Write an enzyme that holds these catalytic residues in place. Structure first.
Site, PDB file in Angstrom:
ATOM      1  N   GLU A 140       0.797  -1.238   0.000  1.00  0.00           N
ATOM      2  CA  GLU A 140       0.000   0.000   0.000  1.00  0.00           C
ATOM      3  C   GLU A 140       0.825   1.283   0.000  1.00  0.00           C
ATOM      4  OE1 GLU A 140      -3.209   2.158   2.987  1.00  0.00           O
ATOM      5  OE2 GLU A 140      -3.012  -0.029   2.802  1.00  0.00           O
TER       6      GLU A 140
ATOM      7  N   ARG B 153      -7.949   3.066  14.129  1.00  0.00           N
ATOM      8  CA  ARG B 153      -8.700   1.826  13.929  1.00  0.00           C
ATOM      9  C   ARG B 153      -8.595   0.876  15.110  1.00  0.00           C
ATOM     10  NH1 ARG B 153     -11.934  -0.992  10.207  1.00  0.00           N
ATOM     11  NH2 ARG B 153     -11.666   0.640   8.620  1.00  0.00           N
TER      12      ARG B 153
ATOM     13  N   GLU C 174     -10.792  -8.089   5.192  1.00  0.00           N
ATOM     14  CA  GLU C 174     -10.116  -8.098   6.496  1.00  0.00           C
ATOM     15  C   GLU C 174     -10.915  -8.498   7.727  1.00  0.00           C
ATOM     16  OE1 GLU C 174      -9.573  -3.928   5.666  1.00  0.00           O
ATOM     17  OE2 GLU C 174      -7.629  -4.158   6.600  1.00  0.00           O
TER      18      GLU C 174
HETATM   19  N1  XAX Z   1      -5.530 -13.425  -1.803  1.00  0.00           N
HETATM   20  C1  XAX Z   1      -5.412 -12.207  -1.214  1.00  0.00           C
HETATM   21  N2  XAX Z   1      -6.472 -11.750  -0.492  1.00  0.00           N
HETATM   22  C2  XAX Z   1      -6.418 -10.542   0.137  1.00  0.00           C
HETATM   23  C3  XAX Z   1      -5.250  -9.634  -0.060  1.00  0.00           C
HETATM   24  C4  XAX Z   1      -4.099 -10.264  -0.789  1.00  0.00           C
HETATM   25  O1  XAX Z   1      -2.935  -9.576  -0.987  1.00  0.00           O
HETATM   26  N3  XAX Z   1      -4.263 -11.469  -1.396  1.00  0.00           N
HETATM   27  N4  XAX Z   1      -5.096  -8.631   1.015  1.00  0.00           N
HETATM   28  C5  XAX Z   1      -6.210  -8.345   1.944  1.00  0.00           C
HETATM   29  C6  XAX Z   1      -6.296  -6.885   2.378  1.00  0.00           C
HETATM   30  S1  XAX Z   1      -5.111  -6.271   3.373  1.00  0.00           S
HETATM   31 MO1  XAX Z   1      -5.298  -3.937   3.491  1.00  0.00          MO
HETATM   32  O2  XAX Z   1      -6.693  -2.717   4.318  1.00  0.00           O
HETATM   33  O3  XAX Z   1      -4.285  -2.937   2.039  1.00  0.00           O
HETATM   34  S2  XAX Z   1      -4.420  -3.852   5.597  1.00  0.00           S
HETATM   35  S3  XAX Z   1      -7.444  -4.566   2.760  1.00  0.00           S
HETATM   36  C7  XAX Z   1      -7.292  -6.060   1.992  1.00  0.00           C
HETATM   37  C8  XAX Z   1      -8.261  -6.508   0.911  1.00  0.00           C
HETATM   38  C9  XAX Z   1      -8.295  -5.587  -0.295  1.00  0.00           C
HETATM   39  O4  XAX Z   1      -9.184  -6.180  -1.217  1.00  0.00           O
HETATM   40  P1  XAX Z   1     -10.778  -5.821  -1.273  1.00  0.00           P
HETATM   41  O5  XAX Z   1     -11.296  -6.913  -0.347  1.00  0.00           O
HETATM   42  O6  XAX Z   1     -10.803  -4.401  -0.738  1.00  0.00           O
HETATM   43  O7  XAX Z   1     -10.976  -5.869  -2.758  1.00  0.00           O
HETATM   44  O8  XAX Z   1      -7.944  -7.808   0.395  1.00  0.00           O
HETATM   45  C10 XAX Z   1      -7.579  -8.750   1.402  1.00  0.00           C
HETATM   46  N5  XAX Z   1      -7.490 -10.073   0.834  1.00  0.00           N
HETATM   47  O1  LIG Z   2      -9.135   3.430   8.160  1.00  0.00           O
HETATM   48  C1  LIG Z   2      -8.588   2.567   7.459  1.00  0.00           C
HETATM   49  O2  LIG Z   2      -8.961   1.351   7.504  1.00  0.00           O
HETATM   50  C2  LIG Z   2      -7.458   2.979   6.553  1.00  0.00           C
HETATM   51  C3  LIG Z   2      -6.880   1.967   5.766  1.00  0.00           C
HETATM   52  C4  LIG Z   2      -5.836   2.283   4.914  1.00  0.00           C
HETATM   53  C5  LIG Z   2      -5.334   3.586   4.820  1.00  0.00           C
HETATM   54  C6  LIG Z   2      -5.859   4.639   5.575  1.00  0.00           C
HETATM   55  C7  LIG Z   2      -6.935   4.381   6.439  1.00  0.00           C
HETATM   56  O3  LIG Z   2      -7.415   5.434   7.178  1.00  0.00           O
END
Ligand code: XAX
Ligand SMILES: O=C(O)c1ccccc1O
Ligand SMILES: Cc1cc2nc3c(=O)[nH]c(=O)nc-3n(C[C@H](O)[C@H](O)[C@H](O)COP(=O)(O)OP(=O)(O)OC[C@H]3O[C@@H](n4cnc5c(N)ncnc54)[C@H](O)[C@@H]3O)c2cc1C
Ligand code: FES
Ligand code: FES
Ligand SMILES: [Ca+2]
Lengths: 1225, 67, 30
Positions: free
Chosen positions: A701, A779, A1160
């Protein structure tokens, strides 16, 4: 003057005329033969992403054999006349998929896809040996294969359908390699050149060369020599040439154990036990017996067993031949054996056990260091004939010193004593004394190790006694799954290199905090193909970077963590860049370093002041309480371990500062911004493209940009395309992980269990810059309630500023930390009150319409139905009975069961990131191309977006396509994060579709029976534009701290998990028996994607809470830098029974087609394993420790075997078994 | 590129300045409509200011234009 | 406002320097 190397790949002959001994098979496949299906995930043998099948003739054993190997450790110089098969080799979407490739893809066994080819090749190899494998064989095949996304469940379910010669000389840039054809030739060679290094499997040497910077300019490979390969049944035992693979050793010894009488095979079964959870198949297929032995690791699992049993070693040089039994004198010091420099180990005879002879072997279920402090042992007793009187005793231990040792003083004193209680007492006292560790002994875990030396012996002592007396809502597989299984999916380093493309290697701080005195490059300048060294002086724009402009692109006057990027080397090949980087001499002047949370609290080293949410009247809630409990709690961080590490390609156009980048990121916008700021160029010059990531997890990220900026600079400087992919050890060291948290808390409660007051001060270890630490803390504070109504509450958080790599987003984003702290004190309230945990959790739950501690209202609060259904399907109450029954009937093994809920707030906590762009084109064949701001990392966002576009437009998915994410199609995108990508991009895709439908409306009226193609062509010819943006922005968001009101979140995702464990109270190992999850994901767009997400997330949580442990030197240097010292869940880690349900009849009115974010929210449910374990520890402590049923004992996360063991306080931990006074019946 | 602007006529008949001129003008207008509320709040601000403010207020800064 | 101004071709300086990329000037993949 070198011979030609000749081998085969997927049936095609390779002739290599200038083979360099340093070249791995993985580097040759990907960079000489253009077969990129086979991946780099670690370079050290742990992960399996690089698995291939090797095929070669055993002349001796007389057959062509097929085995799996790690391409990353196989030198090509071992491969003369070997046949290699890669994933490209067994099938393809172009031709037709092999059934293995097709099955893993249809079973939802592939998310990101980066592990999938290694796994396909593990399964393929098994099927070529055994076309009808058992479920056990299938499972064992996958031992050396790691997956970060799937949770393993689906791959196993999926594949269960299958169940029930002359001297050669090679000459490199540095290394001369000789392949010996005869024993005689070996000894002459060793005599002419004593210093020359043998290499057989290369699984030790390869690591010395790559990771420890050793260079052996002369290598002799003696793998071809028949005498080094023989298996011989003699009257004393079974002899093995020193070159025999561990798999062959294992095959033979298992044949001997099934056939011979039990009494003859005691040693054999010892060797077999040590070999069970030892690496995986790929390693055991190449690792030699003799190589393990002569490596003389302090934590060899084999050498303690060979020493204990007097295994015979036949050792030879030109002229000399001698056989000795392995004893204590064999390892005189660190990494040394009692061999002369000429001498080579020829064979190894593993003895038969005699009458009245008994043997055991054990090893520690944890490893935290490269080569020390992992306890392992072989134990042998021989009695006088028919008696119980000791004639011989041997207890030999690894990981208790810098070499394998034998407890001689102790065992000596036992001769002629009888095998009884007194004996047990005498030996434990001997052991605790002879193997005592000073408190600062390298490796730490001092208590745990002492206790294991004794508990291992207790098991031997008990064992010896026994021996005597519209597709929306449909389960659509990931759209890329098939190509992921076929090795055809392109990941960043799979992109072909330009003819003029160069390579970059970061140059990194080795000091926690220091001035940079000087940087010397004269030795890097001597590496063949060195182009240049880059540092701060070379930046044309700005050296100021990071989310809060508090980081350097390159270190300036000081460094502030181990891994602080100082500069970069550019060379013509990545091996050249790697060599020349290790040789850049940096001169330091140490400064006072701050490392731990505690260091930081004591030195007041913080970013900002405390954050705080407060509600109610605490000094009053505590007044009214019957009960007040205070404590402290720690939770260790976590590495992302995305199977694909960080990667960037930068292409300088040479006009107007233009640059095109391909990058493994979640955040194309910031990559673009950062690159431009460093370059001093407007943002409009820079283009960033993301096809897919082989994993992200929050780790890509922001921190992706550490590599991107560096690479882009090299591209600016040299004017060539440049690329870099991090090795695993670089990745874990530099890019940061999950935030470690410390908590000091106090709960006020009633005798009912009703909470009435809570304060928690949270401290995160944020590391050497701000990054996302502040939002992460926010969070955490929004989640300190979990699912519970707490009338009076104060939560503070502080960001600790430390000389560590800057920690960042990790799936959960501070949520898991505070939810874990929260389940902790909840657990202490139930124990203190003497009530069942699930009654206490139940009574304290929010209701429909309740307000959080930040005053948000909970509408559609579904935790009650999740709870009720999880109780029902998991048969919780019946199983609870069975756990109690088990614990009454078992002394040194205990079961534990726990049910735990979760609530997880959905939205970015910064209001402005809750916006999303889409861009849609319809071409004149009706084919539709969708582009949106989200990135694909395996979570199947594009699949969902295709499914949404298809429903919206009323056309089949086959007409829709998504290629990639790019900064020039959708600008100013938020990072693909916070679980909202499907909500917000789905909405924007939806709007773009609506706009296109309204435009086609009149052509639809004019021709109501027309096909989609007719309408599109009629609208094109009427000059109606068939291109549109779509946009969405989440309404009603904006929490204020100062007023403590307004919506922090759009809605909440809910879930409940039940987990059952069994611990080994003598060793701290445990088995996960059963987990049931029920999850509220609204109405799912794709049940398979969503169950996939629950499962993968749950297993990443069980890693966090039980297995994954990062460990640092006192000076702040990361010691765990790869799969060998850092343990993510493996195939054999998941619960034997693993059930996941999605709640029926619960649409969500807030998001696209009544679905809810799933990424998540389910990670926290992993903690049900932790609290199940803790429940098991409670019963173990009621068994041996004291009689206090309401005792609160601390247990930090991760609950590793060390912490579980040390908490099972007993006569061993206390040393009461030695006759001392301590704490325990 | 075909992934930015699709279904385009060939660059021909001397009309390009004319038609793309109009298509560019229309997209520029849409941007100005969206930027006007932030202009009126801060008339003494710069271009850079209005843009940041519009972004942070979650106003889309991308548009098509057509003629 | 440059409309009506004899502003030089934007790419003209790179065209004179050899720097303006034409299709065959794009580097070849290995
Ligand atoms: N297979 C797989 N699944 C995964 C990811 C991955 O890399 N691979 N990562 C997570 C994370 S970690 Mo974060 O808020 O940037 S802390 S949110 C987030 C999430 C982002 O994907 P949406 O669900 O929003 O499309 O995917 C989840 N599932
Ligand atoms: O509030 C969140 O979950 C968050 C997640 C990624 C980056 C900035 C943010 O405030
Ligand atoms: C992923 C992984 C997991 C592992 N897990 C375990 C584990 O759980 N327990 C454990 O004990 N070990 C483990 N190992 C260590 C492994 O067993 C050894 O690396 C392997 O046995 C070495 O054999 P090799 O043929 O690859 O040796 P090489 O690397 O080729 O050589 C190793 C050393 O032995 C010398 N040598 C080899 N043969 C002879 C000979 N016959 N005469 C004289 N000197 C010789 C070489 O000169 C060199 O110094 C693991 C290794 C990996 C990569
Ligand atoms: S890359 Fe070869 S095992 Fe990880
Ligand atoms: S699918 Fe296995 S690592 Fe992503
Ligand atoms: Ca940080």
């Amino acid at each position: 003057t070198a011979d030609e190397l000749v081998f085969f790949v997927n049936g095609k002959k390779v002739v290599e005329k200038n083979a360099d001994p340093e070249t791995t098979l993985l580097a040759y496949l990907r960079r000489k033969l253009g077969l990129r299906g086979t991946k780099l995930g670690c370079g050290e043998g742990g992960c399996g992403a690089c698995t291939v099948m090797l095929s070669k003739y055993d002349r001796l054993q007389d057959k062509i054999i097929h085995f799996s190997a790690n391409a990353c450790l196989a030198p090509i110089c071992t491969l003369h006349h070997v046949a290699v098969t890669t994933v490209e080799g067994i099938g393809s979407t172009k031709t037709r998929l092999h059934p293995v490739q097709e099955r893993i893809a249809k079973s939802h066994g592939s998310q990101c896809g980066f592990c999938t080819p290694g796994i396909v090749m593990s399964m393929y190899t098994l099927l070529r040996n055994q076309p009808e494998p058992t479920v056990e064989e299938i499972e064992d095949a996958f031992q050396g294969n790691l997956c970060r996304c799937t949770g393993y469940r689906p791959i196993l379910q999926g594949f269960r359908t299958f169940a029930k010669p002359k001297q050669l000389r090679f000459e490199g840039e540095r290394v001369t390699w000789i392949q010996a054809s005869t024993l005689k030739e070996l000894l002459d060679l060793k005599a002419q050149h004593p210093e020359a290094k043998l290499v057989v499997g290369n699984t030790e040497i390869g690591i010395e060369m790559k990771f420890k910077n050793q260079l052996f300019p002369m290598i002799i490979c003696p793998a071809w020599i028949p005498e080094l390969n023989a298996v011989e049944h003699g009257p004393e035992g079974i002899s093995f040439g020193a070159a025999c693979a561990l798999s062959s050793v294992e095959k033979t010894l298992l044949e001997a154990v099934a056939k011979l009488p039990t009494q003859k095979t005691e040693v054999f079964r010892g060797v077999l036990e040590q070999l069970r959870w030892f690496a995986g198949k790929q390693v055991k297929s190449v690792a030699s017996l003799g190589g393990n032995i002569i490596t003389a690791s302090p934590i060899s699992d084999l050498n303690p067993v060979f020493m204990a049993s007097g295994t015979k070693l036949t050792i030879v040089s030109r002229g000399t031949r001698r056989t000795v039994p392995m004893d204590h004198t064999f390892f005189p010091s660190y990494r040394k054996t009692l061999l002369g420099p000429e001498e080579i180990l020829l064979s190894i005879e593993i003895p038969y056990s005699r009458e009245d002879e008994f043997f055991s072997a054990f090893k520690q279920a944890s490893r935290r260091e490269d080569d020390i402090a992992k306890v392992t042992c072989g134990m042998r007793v021989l009695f006088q004939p028919g008696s119980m009187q000791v004639k011989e005793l041997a207890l030999c231990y690894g990981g208790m010193a810098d070499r394998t040792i034998s407890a001689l003083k102790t065992t000596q004193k036992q001769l002629s004593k009888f095998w009884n209680e007194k004996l047990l007492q005498d030996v434990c006292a001997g052991l605790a004394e002879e193997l005592s560790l000073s408190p600062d002994a390298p490796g730490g875990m001092i208590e745990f190790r002492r206790t294991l030396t004794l508990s291992f012996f207790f098991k031997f002592y008990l064992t010896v006694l026994k021996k005597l007396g519209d597709t929306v809502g449909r389960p659509l597989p990931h759209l890329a799954a098939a190509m992921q299984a076929s090795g055809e999916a392109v990941y960043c380093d799979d992109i072909p290199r330009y003819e003029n493309e160069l390579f970059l290697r970061l140059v990194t701080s080795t000091r926690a905090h220091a001035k940079i005195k000087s940087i010397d490059v004269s030795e890097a300048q001597k590496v063949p193909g060195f182009v240049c060294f880059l540092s701060a002086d070379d930046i044309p724009g700005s050296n100021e970077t990071g989310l809060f402009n508090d980081e350097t692109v390159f270190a300036k006057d000081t460094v502030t963590c181990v891994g602080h990027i100082i500069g970069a080397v550019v060379a013509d090949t990545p091996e050249h860049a790697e060599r020349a980087a290790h040789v850049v001499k940096v001169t330091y002047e140490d400064l006072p370093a701050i490392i731990t949370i505690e260091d930081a609290i004591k030195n007041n080293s913080f970013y900002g002041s405390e954050l705080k949410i407060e509600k109610g009247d605490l000094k009053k809630g505590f007044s009214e309480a019957d009960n007040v409990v205070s404590g402290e709690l720690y939770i260790g961080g976590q590495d992302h371990f995305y199977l694909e590490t960080h990667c960037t390609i930068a292409i300088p156009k040479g006009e107007e500062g233009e640059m095109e980048l391909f990058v493994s990121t979640q955040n194309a916008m910031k990559t673009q911004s950062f690159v431009a700021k460093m370059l001093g160029v407007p943002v409009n010059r820079i283009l960033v493209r993301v096809k897919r990531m082989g994993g992200g997890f929050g780790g890509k990220e922001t921190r992706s940009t550490l590599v991107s900026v560096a690479v882009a600079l090299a591209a600016y400087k040299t004017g060539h395309p440049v690329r870099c992919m991090l090795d695993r050890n670089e990745d874990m060291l530099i890019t940061g992980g999950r935030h470690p948290f410390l908590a000091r808390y106090k709960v006020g409660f009633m005798k009912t269990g009703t909470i009435v007051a809570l304060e928690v001060d949270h401290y995160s270890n944020a590391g050497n810059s701000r990054d996302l630490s502040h939002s992460i803390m926010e969070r955490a504070l929004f989640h300190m309630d979990n699912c519970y109504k707490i009338p009076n509450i104060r939560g503070t958080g502080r960001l600790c500023k430390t000389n560590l790599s800057s920690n960042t987003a990790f799936r959960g984003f501070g949520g898991p930390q505070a939810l874990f702290i929260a389940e902790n004190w909840m657990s202490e309230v139930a124990v203190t009150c003497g009530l069942p945990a699930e009654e206490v959790r139940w009574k304290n739950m929010y209701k429909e319409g309740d307000l959080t501690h930040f005053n948000q209202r909970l509408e559609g609060f579904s935790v009650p139905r999740c709870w009720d259904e999880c109780l029902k399907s998991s048969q919780y109450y019946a199983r609870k009975s069975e756990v109690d029954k088990f614990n009454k009937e078992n002394c040194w093994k205990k079961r534990g069961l726990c049910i735990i809920p979760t609530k997880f707030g959905i939205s970015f906590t910064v209001p402005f990131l809750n916006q999303a762009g889409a861009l849609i084109h319809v071409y004149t064949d009706g084919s539709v191309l969708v582009s949106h701001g989200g990135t694909e990392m395996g979570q199947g966002l594009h699949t969902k977006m295709v499914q949404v576009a298809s429903k919206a437009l009323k056309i089949p998915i086959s007409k829709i396509y998504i290629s990639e994410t790019s900064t020039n199609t959708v600008p100013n995108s938020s990072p693909t994060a916070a679980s909202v990508s499907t909500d917000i991009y789905g909405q924007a895709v939806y709007e773009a579709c609506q706009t296109i439908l309204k435009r086609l409306e009149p052509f639809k009226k004019k021709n109501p029976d027309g096909s989609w193609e007719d309408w599109v062509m009629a609208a094109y010819q009427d000059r109606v534009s068939l291109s549109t943006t779509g946009f969405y922005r989440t309404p009603n968001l904006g929490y204020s701290f100062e007023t403590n009101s307004g919506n922090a979140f759009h809605y909440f995702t809910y879930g409940v998990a039940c987990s059952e464990v069994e611990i080994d109270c003598l060793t701290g190992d445990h088995k996960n028996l059963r987990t049931d999850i029920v999850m509220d994901v609204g109405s799912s767009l794709n049940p398979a994607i969503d169950i996939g997400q629950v499962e993968g997330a749950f297993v990443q949580g069980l890693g966090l809470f039980t297995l994954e442990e990062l460990h640092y030197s006192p000076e702040g240097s990361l010691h765990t830098r790869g799969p060998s010292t850092y343990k993510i869940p493996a195939f054999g880690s998941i619960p034997t029974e693993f059930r996941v349900s999605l709640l029926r009849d619960c649409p969500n009115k807030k998001a696209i087609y009544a679905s809810k974010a799933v990424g998540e929210p389910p990670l926290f449910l992993g903690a049900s394993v932790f609290f199940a374990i803790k429940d098991a520890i409670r019963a173990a402590r009621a068994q041996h420790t004291n009689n206090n049923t309401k005792e609160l004992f601390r247990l930090d996360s991760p609950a590793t075997p060390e912490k579980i063991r040390n908490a099972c306080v007993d006569k061993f931990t206390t040393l009461c078994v030695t006759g001392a006074p301590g704490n325990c019946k």
